[PDB]
Amino acid sequence: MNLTELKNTPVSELITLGENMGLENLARMRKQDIIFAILKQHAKSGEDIFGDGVLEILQDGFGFLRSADSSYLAGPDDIYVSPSQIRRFNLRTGDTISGKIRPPKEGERYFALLKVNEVNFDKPENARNKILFENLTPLHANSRLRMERGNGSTEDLTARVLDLASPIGRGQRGLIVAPPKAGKTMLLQNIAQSIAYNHPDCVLMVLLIDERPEEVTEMQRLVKGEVVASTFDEPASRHVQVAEMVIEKAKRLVEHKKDVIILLDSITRLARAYNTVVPASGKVLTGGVDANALHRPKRFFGAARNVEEGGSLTIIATALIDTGSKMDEVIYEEFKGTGNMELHLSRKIAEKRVFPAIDYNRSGTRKEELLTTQEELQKMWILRKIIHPMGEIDAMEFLINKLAMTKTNDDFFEMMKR
Amino acid sequence: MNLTELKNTPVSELITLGENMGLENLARMRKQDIIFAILKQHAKSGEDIFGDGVLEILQDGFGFLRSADSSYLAGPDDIYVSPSQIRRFNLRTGDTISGKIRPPKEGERYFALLKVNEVNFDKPENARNKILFENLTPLHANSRLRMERGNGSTEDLTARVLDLASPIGRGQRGLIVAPPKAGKTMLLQNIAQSIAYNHPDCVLMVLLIDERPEEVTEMQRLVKGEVVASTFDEPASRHVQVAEMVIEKAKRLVEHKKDVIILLDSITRLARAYNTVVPASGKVLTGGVDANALHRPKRFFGAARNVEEGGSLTIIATALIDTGSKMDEVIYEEFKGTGNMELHLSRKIAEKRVFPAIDYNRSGTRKEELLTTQEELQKMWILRKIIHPMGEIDAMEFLINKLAMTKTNDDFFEMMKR
Amino acid sequence: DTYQPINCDDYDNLELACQHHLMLTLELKDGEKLQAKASDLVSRKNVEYLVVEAAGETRELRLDKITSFSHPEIGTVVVSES
Amino acid sequence: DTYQPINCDDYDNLELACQHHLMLTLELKDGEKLQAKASDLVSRKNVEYLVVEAAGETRELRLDKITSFSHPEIGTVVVSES
């Protein structure tokens, strides 16, 4: 049967399937071992087995078709592709490969590819002729990703406030300065739903680094799209592997003229994982961070650009501030001027139990003339002008109750000018 | 006879029983050897012998049934389980096996299992069909463990302050930050007493790492349930083995739709033991702590979850700060944000002799809306708003004084409302 | 009717004969003398079965029906009911 | 008419023979025999070709027209047309 549907079924269904297939002692094994045993038993019959995944290329030369269902974790069910296929079809890291597979032979551990059917959601001949991501010329964001639901519900209120604070464009480089206990998680949640509703064409990618399992489960349950995660139980190498796989897949999708959105949670954890995993360079800055360590996350962060040829890759990451560790303070300090979109959250608003906790007087974008129209820009600047002298929490609640009875944004502007 | 009752028998009574049976020079022998000799003689008589123990599988593939009475210490009285039984019954580490034992033959210096009767307090057939703990989907904590005894005693004051500050839910990952001589032991003891009183159904586990023997005996005598511990005069491998056995037993109990609670004192000592035992990785963080060494404790601490299918594993661990060693500080720093529950004990409050020394302002929970009711949550928010502006010692003394003139939390809430 | 797990020592001796491929003389519940060559055993439906390729027909059977098994080299062990 | 890429295992075996540079047997669709040496496998314009020579001719041949092959070290594999 298809491999991608076996990884979506609940464990009880898989156990029942293996039991009625003739297998036993499957209950106490892991999910991946159950899948591998079921696949081997089915292939014993000799039927056609289909599968799909993302190619990860090891240092030796061969690759593995990791699956996004297990957040690109190594396991016995991964399909092994020899350098034969990497040389034959010019495949880089992150190419989505789908095709038939065969059971392992004697002396072979993992399953092997048999006949590639689609590469990067496209025919191999057209896939091998695409220009590499590095050769694509960067450009400023011009098309705006409007994230107003329009239903007028209380959930859309934070999205409307965010849109009035800092517009989001395709290919934008976003950074959120979220102090602890400032409602960052629900902000990411509503951003994810707004993106999944307003722009179904853009590919949504949410990756969690150094998070608790409950957050992973809730994100998988409520966010529609592709969500991968790396809990704090797994070592730093797992964080590095997940981040690299996601960014490579995003680049390979953008090369096919597609819009990709990546919500990074969070940048400081990835930087700390890189600092832990990198070899020491002999020069260590304050807080215990290596100079060469902090360069690795910049490759991830710098990939956000608007491709002139077609499509774009936008990364809306978040940072940690005043968490008590000077390492994260330094990491934020060096990530300061590297993003065109900045969103400032504050603890003072959150402790008053009024949401969202966006600091409007200090959060905004750069080169916003391209994203918005002329009259919209005029109204936004007028609203910023009137908000500017007011106090922080005062400006926030003024924005909240000005947006209370309003359903959309334009009518709010009309009643503001009145 | 039964091995468990012999292990529960006082040493003097064991000596008298052995002398009556026909043994000698038992007075100057270890308790394990006394039990071994008594069992060997009673087996020479020819009667059937029962026993039980938690399975630990060694490197080769055979297992040993360690006993919780001696904190799973290796001894001559442990039961040997051949790899045949582990292949026959699908048993993992932490499984509680109870059944008939067999006298050792020549060339063997351990008692052997004869016929299994119960596995994890269930029939052998039903134990093989339980889904693994890893495959179970985690969730947020939603069912609350009420700690308020409600009898109006002065001992219940700390439990009431706990319920007011950081509600405890089934599956909540709790961290209690405790400076030295801040009365942490009395807090853990009161929490264990309140849990054993209010919720007799859930399994209570107390884990002590690097603790003086008098504290171990105090915990063993006072705490209802079962207590395992490792005194500081033991190798780090002993602490590692004790922690791994405790967490495997907890996982195997959760697999059977049960609620288990593990009170750990302390996570810092467990992390230090893991650092000592682990092989060097080549990367050393600040304070002389290995980098990968902290991957093992997290797999312990991260095992706390609220399983959607059923059951729960609630781990509350104590962390040590201000101890004057950078190792403890960095260990705390790495475990900073992996817990759903946070509780900050205060040295400054403790030196003022008022108890419990709890810092209300810098303590709380994550997603407390799930555990409590709407009115209770509103009252708690009102109380936190009232307490927050004033000082710390003043806050604790005011809370204690207000809770003193009332019995239950509800009456205190009504009195505050007026 | 319900299958009963056999004692640990009997199972260990039977698996030792299976791995070492000994020449087993089998006495069934009725008492039939059979020349069983034991190779391996399986567990299905929470019931343990032993399969023997006696005369090449490879018959499977339950474990509670065996009164005794013997071998000229290894010590014979009577299957304990308890 | 339309070219069909060969299976991964067959392609891997053929380039294994190529890098090993071993003497090879070629069978065409009609069922003939060519005892010849394969030098390299080259893909051009989305169609892969292999250069095989009986006496140094270096003839370019398509991969789909191959029927089978045999050599004592590597078991014979028959390709699949669909």
Author numbering:
A (entry chain D), B (entry chain C): 1 to 418
C (entry chain c), D (entry chain d): 3 to 84
Could you give the paper's own sentences about this structure?
Bacterial transcription termination factor, ρ, is a hexameric, NTP-dependent 5’–3’ RNA translocase and helicase. A ρ monomer contains N-terminal (NTD) and C-terminal (CTD) domains connected by a flexible linker. The NTD comprises an N-terminal three-helix bundle and a five-stranded β-barrel, the OB-fold, that forms a primary RNA-binding site (PBS); the PBSes are located around one outer rim of the ρ hexamer. The CTDs jointly form a secondary RNA-binding site (SBS) at the center of the ρ hexamer.
We subjected SEC fractions corresponding to ρ-Rof complexes to cryoEM/SPA in the absence and presence of the transition state analog, ADP-BeF3. Multi-particle 3D refinement with ~600,000 particle images yielded two cryoEM reconstructions for each sample, corresponding to two ρ-Rof assemblies. In the first assembly, ρ forms an open hexameric ring (ρA-ρF) bound by five Rof molecules (Rofa-Rofe), while the second assembly represents a ρ pentamer (ρA-ρE) bound by four Rof molecules (Rofa-Rofd). In the presence of ADP-BeF3, we obtained a ~1:1 (ρ6-Rof5:ρ5-Rof4) distribution between the two classes, whereas in the absence of the nucleotide, the equilibrium was shifted towards the lower oligomeric assembly (ρ6-Rof5:ρ5-Rof4 ~ 1:3). The reconstructions do not reveal differences in the ρ-Rof interfaces, irrespective of oligomeric state or bound nucleotide. Rof molecules are bound between protomers ρA-ρB, ρB-ρC, etc., but not preceding or following the terminal ρ subunits, ρA and ρF. In addition, loopβ3-β4 of Rof contacts the N-terminal three-helix bundle of the adjacent ρ protomer, presumably explaining why Rof binding is only observed between neighboring ρ subunits but not at the terminal subunits of the open ring. Thus, Rof bound between two neighboring NTDs of open ρ may stabilize their relative positions, and thus the open-ring conformation.
